[PDB]
Amino acid sequence: RTVSSLKNLLSENLTLIKEKTGNSSDIVIRHFKIGVNNSLAAAIVYIEGIVDNQAIQDYLLQSLMKDNQKNDLNDQNALELISEDIVTMGNVSFADNWNDLLSSLMSGDSLLIVDGINRVLSVSTQGGKGAFTESIGTNLAMVRRIIKTPDLWLESMKIGRVTKTDVTLMYIHGIANDKVVKEIRKRLKNIDIDSILESGYVEQLIEDQTVTPFPTIYNTERPDVVAGNLLEGRIAIFVDGTPFGLIAPALFIQF
Numbered sequence: 001r002t003v004s005s006l007k008n009l010l011s012e013n014l015t016l017i018k019e020k021t022g023n024s025s026d027i028v029i030r031h032f033k034i035g036v037n038n039s040l041a042a043a044i045v046y047i048e049g050i051v052d053n054q055a056i057q058d059y060l061l062q063s064l065m066k067d068n069q070k071n072d073l074n075d076q077n078a079l080e081l082i083s084e085d086i087v088t089m090g091n092v093s094f095a096d097n098w099n100d101l102l103s104s105l106m107s108g109d110s111l112l113i114v115d116g117i118n119r120v121l122s123v124s125t126q127g128g129k130g131a132f133t134e135s136i137g138t139n140l141a142m143v144r145r146i147i148k149t150p151d152l153w154l155e156s157m158k159i160g161r162v163t164k165t166d167v168t169l170m171y172i173h174g175i176a177n178d179k180v181v182k183e184i185r186k187r188l189k190n191i192d193i194d195s196i197l198e199s200g201y202v203e204q205l206i207e208d209q210t211v212t213p214f215p216t217i218y219n220t221e222r223p224d225v226v227a228g229n230l231l232e233g234r235i236a237i238f239v240d241g242t243p244f245g246l247i248a249p250a251l252f253i254q255f
Contacts, residue, residue, distance in 0.1 A: 022153030035074035049141030170236035215249040
């Protein structure tokens with residue numbers, strides 16, 4: 001049961017999260033300071049849109065503890081002293097290895113990391129028709145709710161021929177073939193997404209019947225269908241304003 005322990009420096013823990021989660025665009029790091037003379041650096045780490053954090057962020061980032069901020073003059077009991085308030089705001093747990101930390105993060109928890117503690121505090125705000133929308137943020141969150149691996153890597157980019165359109169690319173690192181990912185990313189950067197999508201309209205399919213350059217794409221409004229293709233080694237693309245996920249390549253036969 002090989003377990004990697006957490007680093008004492010906050011900087012080291014943050015660099016390693018970024019490393020392990022593939023510097024995914026929806027993973028938020030909020031830096032803040034705690035202690036008497038704001039000497040102790042701390043951070044809130046959470047995945048965007050799969051958590052109700054405001055009350056916790058409000059407490060932490062506005063420093064809503066004081067008095068008792070003086071009771072324990074930080075560094076050693078900081079995390080445990082802070083936890084006494086956070087338990088009133090959500091279900092608190094503690095992680096002391098990467099597996100536990102990463103799984104709690106992927107499950108919509110908020111992580112609280114302090115400068116030199118090496119134990120991470122997890123807090124949960126949940127207790128246990130559904131199609132994609134015009135919002136990338138909402139769509140990413142929908143996939144993140146189904147695929148709970150830190151190996152799901154999200155890459156944001158601006159593609160477009162005349163004007164730029166915001167796009168988020170998805171793939172499961174280690175499952176998806178790197179040569180396939182590199183090729184799809186390369187094509188996207190120079191794709192005429194407007195022409196490609198317009199060629200998919202029923203009117204154009206009925207009359208035009210144009211050829212499709214690599215990669216062929218499949219449109220789905222179902223997050224479970226996106227989740228299934230991601231577990232097969234395919235790439236999911238979310239374009240700003242389009243209420244569906246684009247699976248690439250559409251024809252992908254494995255052996």
